Amino acid sequence: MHSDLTFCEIILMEMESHDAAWPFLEPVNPRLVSGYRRIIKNPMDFSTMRERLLRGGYTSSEEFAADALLVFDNCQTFNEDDSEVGKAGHIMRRFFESRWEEFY
């Protein structure tokens, strides 16, 4: 309900300020990341999710979690599990999955 979206605000704020958030704060600039345009067919990042959440672009917490899990699916698609970005994506994905279950 109304709490459906105040939930997402808590988690997105906590993800935005997380230590391991840096690879996901703003969209990937494909000019600087070769191959990213070819490989990732639906880029997503925390700032895009913030924009959408601010303008009411989510009708439920489900669609919010869809965008979050898309951030981490793209991360694992593009980065090796032992790359620096990959390690941060695993730390972030486990955080998100945890906090998400601590409400639902």
Ligand SMILES: NC(=O)c1cc(OC2CCNCC2)ccn1
């Ligand atoms: N969130 C991401 O997927 C992501 C990928 C990325 O690619 C870079 C990673 C470092 N070496 C060159 C390519 C850089 C930042 N972030």
